[PDB]
Nucleic acid binder design. Structure first.
Ligand SMILES: [K+]
Ligand SMILES: [K+]
Ligand SMILES: [Mg+2]
Ligand SMILES: [Mg+2]
Length: 135
RNA sequence: ACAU
DNA sequence: CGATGT
């Protein structure tokens, strides 16, 4: 119904899919960029969306913040809930880095706790998520 | 079909 | 138009 403005919003940006993947987290209210991941040479949209949420979890936990996280990705929200990123991306030398980060993100989820609500950004009602890459 |  | 996903 209503945007929870006291929140973190995340989004992925890519050059190709699969292709170069980056992501960032912003203050939903102000747009302030809170974290930005260095571009990853090959990954998928959904792996980036997943990494963005998990990074947001780690970011908020380190800062003792109970803010929720918004993502517009049905897929990544489910993957985080499951603690399992069910990507189809081939594992090879070229995809080694993104798969390493995804593996490590799952591992973090399986060794830490959090109460952070992970919320679906309702793009059809509210427009583009505040972390959008204007892409 | 829905979400990217 | 193509790809990633439930
Ligand atoms: K975009
Ligand atoms: K499809
Ligand atoms: Mg997105
Ligand atoms: Mg976007």
């Amino acid at each position: 119904e209503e945007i929870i403005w006291e929140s973190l919003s995340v989004d992925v940006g890519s050059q190709g899919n699969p292709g170069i993947v980056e992501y960032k987290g912003v203050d939903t209210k102000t747009g302030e960029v809170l974290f930005e991941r260095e571009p990853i040479p090959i990954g998928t949209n959904n792996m980036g969306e997943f990494l963005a949420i998990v990074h947001g979890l780690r970011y908020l936990k380190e800062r003792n913040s109970r803010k929720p996280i918004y993502s517009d990705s049905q897929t990544a929200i489910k993957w985080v809930k499951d603690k399992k990123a069910k990507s189809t991306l081939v594992r090879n030398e070229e995809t080694a880095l993104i798969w390493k980060l995804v593996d490590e993100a799952e591992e973090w989820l399986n060794t830490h706790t959090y109460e952070t609500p992970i919320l679906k950004w309702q793009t059809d009602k509210w427009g583009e998520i505040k972390a959008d890459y204007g892409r």
